[PDB]
Amino acid sequence: MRGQIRGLEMASKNSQDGISLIQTAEGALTETHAILQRVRELVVQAGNTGT
Amino acid sequence: MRGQIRGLEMASKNSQDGISLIQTAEGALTETHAILQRVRELVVQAGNTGT
């Protein structure tokens, strides 16, 4: 039982680290996203403004 | 949705620029027009005044 409890607690640590990682990469993709929003503004604005 | 909203707003800008362009060229043709009115006055007045 102490085996399972200790290993499980350290597993909780492991999982929280995972939450950290995925949180970082996610916010990174959020920035990527907003940038690409600006990109579409620059593809509409680079519609040659028609010509 | 933010894609469509942003791109659409900048599209409104694009269209208003188009309104500007067409407004300019239109007023130019208006001047051309009135000039050609004077031209017909000068083709009637250059009817040789008959002779």
Give the determination technique: cryo-EM
Task: Judge residue A49's burial from the number of C-beta atoms within 10 Å of its C-beta, 0-12 exposed, 13-18 middle, 19 or more buried.
Answer: middle
Rounded CA separation A26/A13 (Å): 20
Q: Are residues A40 and B11, on separate chains, in Cβ contact within 8 Å?
A: no
Q: Around Cβ B7, how many Cβ atoms within 10 Å?
A: 20
- Cβ separation B13–A45 shorter than 8 A: yes
> Of B9, B12, B14, which to mutate for an interface test with A (greatest number of A Cβ within 10 Å)?
B14
CA dihedral sign, ordered A38, A41, A46, A47: positive
